[PDB]
Amino acid sequence: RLKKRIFAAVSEGCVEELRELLQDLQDLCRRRRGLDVPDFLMHKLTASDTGKTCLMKALLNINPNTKEIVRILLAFAEENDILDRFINAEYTEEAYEGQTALNIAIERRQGDIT
Amino acid sequence: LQRARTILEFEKMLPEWLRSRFRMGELCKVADEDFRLCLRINEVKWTEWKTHVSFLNEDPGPIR
Numbered sequence: 001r002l003k004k005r006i007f008a009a010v011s012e013g014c015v016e017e018l019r020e021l022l023q024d025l026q027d028l029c030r031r032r033r034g035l036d037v038p039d040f041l042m043h044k045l046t047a048s049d050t051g052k053t054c055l056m057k058a059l060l061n062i063n064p065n066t067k068e069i070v071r072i073l074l075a076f077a078e079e080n081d082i083l084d085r086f087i088n089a090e091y092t093e094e095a096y097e098g099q100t101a102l103n104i105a106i107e108r109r110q111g112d113i114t
Numbered sequence: 115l116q117r118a119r120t121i122l123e124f125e126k127m128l129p130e131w132l133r134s135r136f137r138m139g140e141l142c143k144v145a146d147e148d149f150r151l152c153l154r155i156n157e158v159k160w161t162e163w164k165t166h167v168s169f170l171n172e173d174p175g176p177i178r
Contacts, residue, residue: 060172062165095175109165 013063038082051092059104
């Protein structure tokens with residue numbers, strides 16, 4: 001009930017809804033036993049059926065406030081130190097295998113987010 | 115126009131249970147509770163460049 005709300009707030013442009021859900025991700029991992037915290041937080045942002053992350057979902061759905069949404073997601077992945085695995089993720093299905101977030105940002109003609 | 119009149123006169127002849135098998139189109143969820151039985155045409159355009167909104171599907175490839 002947490003993962004489905006993050007993908008919904010990102011696709012529609014909800015700024016304050018998205019930021020409230022990110023503090024609950026820190027609070028849910030804090031009470032965790034804590035073995036593979038950088039591995040645990042990745043499968044809470046990656047759809048296990050397709051491989052799509054939440055940064056890919058923001059760039060496919062261009063909003064009038066999508067430039068500030070990307071800044072919030074990068075500052076979250078910087079604090080918990082999975083910024084390399086978050087910005088370099090790939091699809092796993094055969095139809096889109098190898099597509100990253102930079103292929104999506106160039107195709108939407110975004111000169112600033114690139 | 116002369117071939118189109120030949121196509122249609124063949125279609126009034128064959129029975130009702132044949133017209134369901136050779137029926138054109140596919141049901142498409144356009145909006146909330148709206149199914150319209152549309153027909154798909156592909157297109158390549160190189161002149162007007164723009165960013166894409168107002169699409170029905172995010173994933174571009176043919177799904178089945």
